Write a protein that binds this DNA or RNA. Structure first.
Ligand SMILES: *O[C@H]1[C@@H](O)[C@H](n2ccc(=O)[nH]c2=O)O[C@@H]1COP(=O)(O)O
Lengths: 182, 1629
RNA sequence: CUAUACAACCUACUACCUCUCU
RNA sequence: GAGGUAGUAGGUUGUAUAG
């Protein structure tokens, strides 16, 4: 049925007598495909049926010979800090331009109140740190911190604590001033 | 790279070494490692004087006697010398066995040696050398003050020992220049020496071309409005940060102000780049919150400055933009590099990042400026990424923005420009920068980026110490005016030509002589460590009151020119230089050296290599697979043997009869005996088989086949009484052959005719019978039976016949018992296994569907068994395949295959479901008896193996005919061959310390009480001040920069040669215009004839190394050229009357491994290829004696390569003598009297297949028809396998090599050489002589006499001329003196030499220029390579383990390696006597030998350079290739001194290689990477390396998962990987 | 030229199926 | 004896990797 047709045809004939003999005729000597070709010599005495078969495998060559026998039949971070501050600067609004168009030398503008207005205007807050010790000069200093993405400190100093925080907010106004102008 | 160099820059340490060898010397060099090498070598050089004078040497040092471990220099003098060197312990108490009278070098304290001279325990006249370690120390000056002022000065200069002081450099004295010069002069008068300086610094300041130094100032900086805002914001931040309170920002402050006040705002924000990149990490990395606030406020200040400077020129508004704010500065430096538009501009700094950013600046100015386009600009991964990036940068700029590392050691091409942007505070670094500009003209730039007058005083100091360095030193440099007048003189002079008729030949003159000499010196064979230069001595003399100079040139030791080229005197130094080099060039061309593949052989057929015509065009068609390779296969005819062609017995002719005598020697195992049969000996066969032939078969070996009965030996035996055949006997024997090879064996197949009258493969096989009286003869009545019983069909006997006949057992005992009822056309032949009386046709059936056997035969066939009382037959299947050559149950290694199980033996031994039972009346007894059937199926392997033995005997016949190698036709009966059996038995921190001595100390001063301002100092200071200010050395701040770039011929003779007259050469010359070099030699000969007394003066440090050739005699030779029993290697049997190699072994070498047989070429192929290399090496050496080894290796690679062996194989046609497929009797073996046509395979590929139509029949004969009829009968409707077989070309080369091996094994190396001559590559000298009286005698080697009776007898190896180069008066005496201390080398090796020139030639490196008497090791290395190669291959071939191909090649390839040879060299102290003046080689060999002795001289190839648990990670171990070449070269030298004998070389090298042989042989240890790969095949990986900062070393890490990461270190990648794998293996053990 | 892995192909074995012989 | 599945042993030809 579904097996090697050499075996099938061997049994099929051996039920009716006569003994077939397969023979190797040419081993092929190719470079990477050394195939084999066999030939069945069925009954070379009376009515010789000698069928050839090609195949890479000896089973496949005998199978093809049997089928032939059947078939013939049917920095950058200092850069990066600068651009998003510009986005914060566009998000600030008008007080940047008032900061440009005023003089920061005068103390008649209140630096802490103006920087608090900037904080209210541009959705952040301002931090004022006056550390408790006294300097070698015997005066007071403050740091203002910009509550945004970067770290942020502008410095200031003065004879009193309030003047130190005012000068820190003045330097923060110088900061936000000096990014502003185009 | 074309280093067209000036004169010969010798090795600078060796240069200082020679100056120390001449006179008392203070060495001016900084590195203490180089100073140790110089000290060591000078001790080695004066060791010979100390021995032959009975003297001693003393080394005085400072740190000695402090620490318990010995000093470094003691470790080197006990490791790398043969010298008895002694170390004094801290507070040494004298042991009784220790003495200075019996120690070579004594390393002593100055106080100790002072005590020795006080107490007469050592004598000053017995001291040969005193060496002072760091004698520029003031404290050790005071220490040697009693030493020198009490003993050295009172001693006379005759008794004064030679004095060396390893001092620090003179730019490192720790004094002002006045007091430096005073300290100098007191120091030379103190220690009785002179300063010899000759550093790389000195080498460029005099020996290299002068770079003009240009000095451009840099102005200070002011602020514009933007920079006023920058300064305002920064000083506000500084004045705030001073008061900021916390009860590293200053670094950012103190650098940002400088980059503001020195470059400007653009570079200020591009430094805010780096500093804000620093702060963006360092404000996050800090844990303190107020420090975080401080760092982030500094970061926001940098944000301010970057915002202002970005709001300054991109927002307010670009070469004008960068030139506006940033100061120009670099403009003059740029114009300096623009005027040079081969430029190799180098810029030097002291920081790596400055070098990177300046590379970026030169890169961006290269791409931006159109005129400047021509400027071509744990966790070890980032280290390699950085290292690869920096070398990419270096390659892009060099084809260099350097730092302090590119100052010493790095070799670069010659430069035009060297830049110093950084103002040099140190002279040493300044001139190491300046040292590279060499291209003549080349320039140096100083950029200083009152005080100007003080730096002018500092360069005045630098120029003045430069003048002291050049003035007090060694041999000077002539000034450039002499080169100017040489350029003037050489303009009209015409160059010398090699061929005077050819005007356009090699133009060589005075103007290019030195360049040709130096290019020839560079092109000699050398490795990295070798620096080959020529040693040039100059000499002053006076002629006619005019100064002239003689210039003795000496070329390197590798060059075959071994005498001194003496130049002839010219007025100055430079013309003497050019004439000496041109005389050297012509002296070279007299011996033809002017310049592998350029060299060709000196004998004809060596350079012929005649290609076969179509094989030639196969060679130039490179698209085809190449000849000599495995990938191309040719189809050869299987030669039927000579004794089997045209030997067919014909009527009337008396014929030879051989009985094919079989003899069973090993019965089959019962484990093999599955069916338990009786064992049948084939000698019990009353009927055997015989061969009838008319040409006599020679004596043949008895070979073994393996059938069912087991191992059966096969031999042939001649019958005494010859056979004469009648016509009818011919007819019946032809019918018998057709029957036996058509029906009994069915070997007859399609396309196959029995043709009895053939001319090829024509022989008879006859059924012989044991005579009943005795003996064997042709069975005539059996032949009558075969005549009666031809191809008779088996007949179905009727019922009446079986009823009539009873059962006879002896009819069916020992007979083939074929059944007639089944298999009518191709009957199945069955043996008789047993006859069962208990069985019957009524006995019980095993199966279920049938009852007893009579009912079975009644049911399935319809046949009635008439007699049911007959006994039955247990039968076997007969032998289907008839190949019995390989034993059925053994592997190729001799390992038995698995036998059958005992259950499947016994269960199927007695069950009736297995076995085969037959009824005797249902069978036909075939006429062939069964023992006759056994030998009849034995026959076809007998015929194939006899045809194999006879083809091997045909090859032996062909060699013994064409070259007299044995008897031509071996037909003597009293001789037999060996049996054909298959073999199947059935230091960095010290460099850091010397860097520290260069950097920070540089101190120490003796005295100041004299008057140092001697006016002449102040005069020289003011003179240098005026010369610098006025001469353009000082370029002022307003001045920019300076990039600037006749005589009658007879009167020319007076100017050029002032020792001749005006009228003498007027008549002497006549027509002659210019005196050529021969004429100049004639003229100087005439003048030394007309002035017979000549004087000479030693000028410079033209050294006293050499002597003899140039010195010593000093007598007017001054003006022109006046068999072990336990297996041997050279086993030489007789060649006269020796029958030669057996055809068994020639057959073994013929048949491949592809044939699956038990005999193989491969072991003989290995021994044959190795002897081919060995003998071609030894003859190649002895032939071309002056030719260096590279060309000889190219000739041997033209010899041994398998294309040439394939050509000799096809010329001898060995393809038609070999076996290429396993013998299979049905497919690849033509029986007697048949033929296979060749062309129908072109008719078989498709074509003739609609259907059959022919069934043979129509093509009755193809051989009888002509080829036109063949092509016709093919066209009326890729190789033969029956008589042809396909063999690849490399296998033919393998057979040629294996045949050489076969001839080697039997008839000696001399027989192998003669057989090598037989193939076609010559190895022996022909002595083509006339006829030797008796031509019939051939003395071994003598070919056939030609048409004019000339024999071409092959002669032996000539003895080569020793390379003792007699060009010296006392070359033997200089050989005896230069080879001192080699006696203990000989005792450490074993073999005393006769000619010690071979010893010195082996142990001279290519660098050791004090050696005139030999050549280098490279010739003896090239010889001892192949000598050791053959010695290893033959000692491993004879191994009774019987190595396979792969096993033998692995065992050799790990037994032959340079690591192995270096290790075995170092164990027996072959480093101790390696005379080398190479520095890097000395350090490599030194650290290797020290960490080999740290391994205690065990042979480790592997366990000296790693453990992860040892802190050896800095400065791993360096395996020297040179000492491996030394072991090879001393092998060659031992071989040559033995009159070319190998048994002496192995007698020596057993004691040096046999432990490693047995160690790697006994266990298979695998490859060390591959063993870890076999333990884990997906786990062990090897990452990329890293290089440490030490300068030679590589680190590679292996990882084994769940076992750890194991670190590794090696100079190369391979040793680091291998030893990481090994230390992983040691941890996993 | 040396080492390792994968694919094919061949035959020597061994144990066992599918038939046949027995 | 034939066809088939596994191991075991010898090898021929490629592909890839490292020395
Ligand atoms: O069928 C073959 C084999 O199995 C069988 N035979 C023969 C002899 C013997 O001792 N044992 C045995 O199993 O007979 C046939 C012969 O083929 P081989 O010659 O054994 O290859």
């Amino acid at each position: 049925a579904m097996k090697t047709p050499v075996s099938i045809l061997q049994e099929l004939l051996s039920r009716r007598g006569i003994t077939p003999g397969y023979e190797l005729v040419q081993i092929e000597g190719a470079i990477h495909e050394p195939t084999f070709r066999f030939r069945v010599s069925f009954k070379d005495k009376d009515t010789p049926f000698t069928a050839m078969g090609a195949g890479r495998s000896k089973k496949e060559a005998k199978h093809a010979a049997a089928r032939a026998l059947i078939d013939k039949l049917i920095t950058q971070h200092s850069n990066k800090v600068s651009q998003f501050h510009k986005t914060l600067k566009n998000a600030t609004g008008k007080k940047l331009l008032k900061l440009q168009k005023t003089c920061l030398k005068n103390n008649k503008i209140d630096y802490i109140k103006l920087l608090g207005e900037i904080a209210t205007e541009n959705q952040f807050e301002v931090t004022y740190v006056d550390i408790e010790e006294k300097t070698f000069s015997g005066q007071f200093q403050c740091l203002v911190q910009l509550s945004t993405l970067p770290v942020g400190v502008c410095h200031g100093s003065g004879p009193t604590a309030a003047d130190a925080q005012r000068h820190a907010a003045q330097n923060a106004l110088e900061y936000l001033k000096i990014m502003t102008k185009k | 790279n074309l280093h067209t160099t000036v004169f010969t820059p010798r090795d600078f340490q060796v240069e200082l070494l020679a100056t120390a060898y001449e006179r008392n010397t203070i060495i001016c060099l900084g590195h203490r490692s180089s100073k140790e090498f110089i000290a060591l070598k000078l001790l080695q050089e004066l060791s010979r004087r100390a021995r032959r004078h009975g003297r001693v040497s003393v080394y005085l040092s400072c740190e000695v006697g402090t620490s318990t471990e010995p000093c470094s220099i003691y470790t080197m003098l006990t490791h790398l010398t043969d010298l008895r060197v002694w170390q004094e312990q801290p507070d040494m108490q004298i042991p009784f066995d220790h003495c200075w009278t019996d120690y070579h070098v004594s390393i002593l304290r100055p106080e100790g040696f002072l005590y020795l001279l006080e107490t007469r325990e050592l004598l000053l006249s017995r001291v040969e050398l005193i060496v002072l370690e760091d004698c520029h120390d003031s404290a050790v000056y005071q220490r040697i003050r009693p030493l020198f002022e009490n003993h050295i000065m009172p001693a006379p200069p005759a008794d004064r020992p030679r004095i060396l002081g390893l001092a620090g450099p003179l730019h490192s004295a720790g004094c002002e220049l006045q007091q430096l010069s005073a300290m100098l002069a007191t120091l030379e008068q103190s220690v009785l020496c002179q300063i010899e300086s000759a550093s790389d610094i000195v080498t460029v300041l005099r020996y290299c071309s002068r770079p003009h130094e240009y000095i451009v100032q840099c102005a200070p900086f002011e602020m514009d409005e933007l920079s006023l805002v920058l300064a305002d914001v920064l000083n506000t931040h500084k004045s705030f940060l001073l008061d900021h309170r916390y009860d590293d920002p200053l670094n950012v402050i103190n650098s940002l102000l400088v980059v503001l006040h020195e470059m400007g705002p653009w570079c200020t924000q591009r430094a805010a780049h780096h500093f804000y990149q620093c702060n963006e990490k360092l404000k996050v990395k800090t844990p303190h919150e107020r420090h975080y606030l401080l760092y982030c406020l500094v970061s926001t200040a940098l944000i301010q400055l970057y915002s202002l400077c970005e709001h300054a020129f991109h927002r307010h508004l670009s070469r004008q933009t960068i030139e506006r704010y940033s100061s120009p500065k670099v403009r003059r430096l740029l114009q300096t590099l623009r005027c040079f538009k081969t430029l190799c501009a180098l810029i030097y700094c002291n920081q790596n990042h400055t070098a990177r950013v300046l590379f970026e600046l030169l890169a961006e100015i290269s791409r931006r400026d159109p005129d400047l386009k021509f400027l071509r600009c744990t966790e070890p991964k980032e280290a390699e990424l950085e290292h690869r990036r920096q070398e990419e940068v270096l390659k892009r700029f060099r084809m260099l923005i350097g730092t302090s590392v590119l100052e010493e050691g790095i070799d670069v091409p010659k430069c035009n420009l060297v830049v110093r942007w950084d103002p040099p505070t140190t002279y040493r670094s300044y001139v190491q920068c300046k040292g590279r500009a060499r291209a003549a003209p080349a320039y140096h730039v100083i950029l200083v980026a009152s005080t100007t007058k003080d730096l002018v005083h500092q360069m005045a100091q630098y120029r003045e110490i430069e003048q002291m360095l050049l003035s007090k030193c060694a041999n000077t440099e002539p000034p450039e005016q002499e080169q100017c007048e040489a350029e003037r003189f050489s303009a009209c002079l015409a160059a010398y030509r090699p061929k005077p008729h050819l005007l356009t030949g090699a133009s060589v003159d005075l103007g290019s002589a030195i360049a040709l000499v130096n290019k020839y010196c560079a092109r000699l064979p050398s490795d990295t460590f070798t620096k080959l230069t020529a040693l040039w001595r100059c000499t002053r003399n006076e002629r006619a009151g005019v100064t002239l100079f003689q210039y003795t040139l000496r070329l390197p030791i590798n060059s075959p020119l071994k005498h001194d080229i003496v130049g002839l005197p010219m007025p100055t130094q430079t013309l003497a230089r050019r004439l000496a080099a041109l005389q050297a060039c012509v002296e070279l061309h007299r011996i033809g050296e002017l310049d592998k593949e350029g060299f060709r052989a000196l004998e004809p057929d060596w350079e012929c290599f005649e290609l076969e015509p179509e094989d030639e065009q196969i060679v130039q068609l490179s698209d085809e697979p190449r000849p000599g390779t495995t990938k191309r296969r040719q189809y050869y005819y299987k030669r039927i043997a000579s004794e089997f062609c045209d030997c067919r017995p014909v009527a009337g002719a008396p014929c030879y009869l051989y009985f094919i005598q079989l003899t069973l020697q090993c019965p089959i195992p019962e484990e093999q005996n599955t069916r338990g049969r009786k064992i049948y000996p084939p000698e019990d066969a009353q009927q055997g088989f015989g061969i009838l032939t008319t040409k006599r078969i020679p004596k043949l070996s008895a070979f073994s086949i393996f059938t069912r009965s087991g191992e059966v030996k096969v031999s042939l035996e001649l019958a005494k009484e010859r056979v004469i055949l009648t016509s009818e006997q011919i007819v019946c024997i032809n019918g018998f052959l057709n029957y036996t090879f058509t029906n009994v064996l069915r070997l007859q197949k399609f396309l196959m005719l029995f043709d009895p009258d053939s001319t090829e493969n024509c022989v008879f096989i006859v059924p012989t019978v044991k005579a009943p009286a005795g003996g064997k003869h042709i069975d005539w009545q059996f032949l009558e039976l075969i005549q009666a019983n031809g191809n008779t069909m088996p007949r179905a006997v009727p019922d009446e016949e079986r009823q009539a006949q009873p059962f006879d057992p002896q009819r069916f005992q020992d007979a083939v018992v074929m059944p007639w009822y089944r298999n009518q056309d191709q009957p199945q032949y069955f043996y008789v296994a047993e006859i069962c009386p208990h069985l019957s046709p009524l006995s019980c059936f095993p199966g279920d569907n049938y009852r007893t056997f009579k009912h079975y035969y009644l049911v399935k066939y319809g046949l009635t068994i008439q007699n049911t009382s007959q006994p039955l037959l247990d039968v076997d299947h007969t032998s289907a395949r008839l190949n019995f050559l390989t034993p059925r149950y053994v592997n190729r290694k001799g390992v038995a295959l698995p036998t059958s199980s005992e259950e499947t033996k016994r269960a199927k031994r007695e069950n009736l479901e297995q076995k085969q039972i037959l009824v005797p009346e249902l069978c036909t007894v075939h006429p062939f008896p069964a023992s006759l059937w056994r030998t009849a199926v034995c026959l076809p392997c007998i015929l194939y193996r006899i045809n194999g033995l006879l083809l091997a005997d045909d090859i032996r016949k062909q060699v013994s005919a064409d070259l007299g190698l044995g008897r031509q036709q071996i037909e003597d009966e009293d001789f037999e061959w060996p049996m054909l059996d298959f073999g199947w038995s059935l230091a960095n921190e010290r460099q850091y310390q010397q860097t520290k001595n260069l950097l920070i100390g540089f101190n120490f001063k003796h005295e100041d009480q004299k008057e140092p301002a001697t006016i002449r100092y102040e005069e020289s200071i003011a003179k240098l001040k005026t010369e610098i200010e006025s001469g353009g050395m000082l370029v002022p701040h307003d001045q920019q920069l300076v990039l600037k770039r006749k005589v009658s011929m007879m009167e020319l003779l007076k100017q050029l040669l002032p020792y001749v007259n005006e009228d003498v050469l007027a008549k002497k010359l006549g027509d002659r215009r210019e005196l050529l070099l021969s004429d100049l030699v004639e003229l100087n000969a005439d003048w030394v004839a007309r002035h017979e007394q000549e004087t000479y003066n030693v000028m410079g440090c033209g050294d006293s190394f050499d002597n003899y050739n140039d010195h010593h005699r000093l007598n007017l030779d001054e003006k022109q050229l006046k068999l072990p029993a336990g297996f041997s290697f050279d086993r030489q049997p007789d060649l006269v009357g020796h029958p030669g190699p057996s055809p068994s072994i020639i057959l073994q070498a013929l048949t491949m491994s592809n044939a699956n047989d038990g005999i193989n070429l491969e072991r003989l192929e290995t021994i044959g290829d190795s002897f081919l290399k060995y003998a071609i090496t030894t003859y190649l050496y002895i032939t071309y004696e002056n030719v260096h080894e590279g060309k000889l290796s190219h000739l041997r690679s033209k010899q041994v390569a398998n294309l040439n062996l394939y050509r000799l194989g096809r010329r001898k046609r060995l393809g038609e003598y070999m076996i290429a497929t396993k013998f299979e009797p049905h497919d690849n073996w033509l029986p007697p009297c048949y033929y296979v046509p060749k062309e129908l395979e072109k008719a078989l590929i498709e074509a003739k297949i609609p259907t059959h139509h022919w069934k043979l029949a129509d093509l009755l004969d193809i051989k009888n028809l002509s080829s036109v009829q063949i092509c016709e009968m093919v066209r009326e409707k890729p190789y033969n396998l029956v008589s042809q077989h396909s063999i690849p070309d490399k296998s033919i080369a393998d057979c040629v090599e294996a045949l050489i091996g076969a001839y080697l094994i039997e008839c000696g190396p001399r027989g192998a050489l003669l057989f090598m001559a037989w193939l076609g590559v010559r190895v022996l000298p022909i002595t083509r002589q006339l006829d030797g009286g008796n031509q019939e005698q051939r003395i071994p080697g003598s070919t056939k006499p030609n048409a004019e009776n000339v024999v071409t007898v092959y002669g032996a190896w000539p003895t080569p001329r020793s390379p003792l180069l007699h060009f010296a008066p006392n070359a033997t005496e200089e050989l005896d003196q230069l080879l001192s201390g080699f006696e203990e080398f000989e005792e450490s090796l074993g073999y005393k030499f006769r000619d010690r020139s071979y010893l010195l030639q082996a142990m001279t490196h290519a660098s050791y220029t004090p050696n005139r008497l030999t050549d280098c090791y490279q010739r003896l290395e090239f010889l001892g390579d192949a000598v050791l190669d053959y010695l290893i291959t033959r000692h491993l071939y004879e191994d009774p383990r019987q190595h396979s191909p792969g096993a033998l090649t692995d065992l050799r390839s790990a037994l032959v390696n340079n690591t192995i040879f270096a290790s075995l060299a170092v164990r027996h102290g072959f480093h101790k006597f390696f005379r080398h003046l190479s520095p890097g080689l000395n350090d490599v060999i030194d650290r290797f030998v020290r960490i080999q002795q740290e391994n205690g001289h065990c042979i480790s190839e592997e366990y000296y350079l790693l453990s992860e648990e040892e802190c050896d990670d800095a400065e791993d171990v360096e395996v020297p290739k040179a000492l491996g070449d030394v072991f090879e070269s001393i092998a060659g030298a031992i071989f040559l001194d033995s009159n070319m004998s190998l048994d002496v070389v192995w007698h020596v090298y057993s004691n040096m290689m046999s432990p490693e042989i047995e160690q790697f042989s006994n266990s298979v240890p695998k490859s060390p990477i591959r063993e870890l790969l076999e333990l884990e095949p997906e786990t062990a990986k090897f990452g990329k390396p890293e290089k440490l900062a030490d300068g030679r070393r590589v680190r590679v890490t292996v990882d084994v998962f769940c076992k750890g990461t194991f670190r590794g270190i090696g100079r190369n990648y391979r040793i680091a990987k291998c030893t990481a794998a090994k230390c992983a293996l040691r941890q996993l053990k």
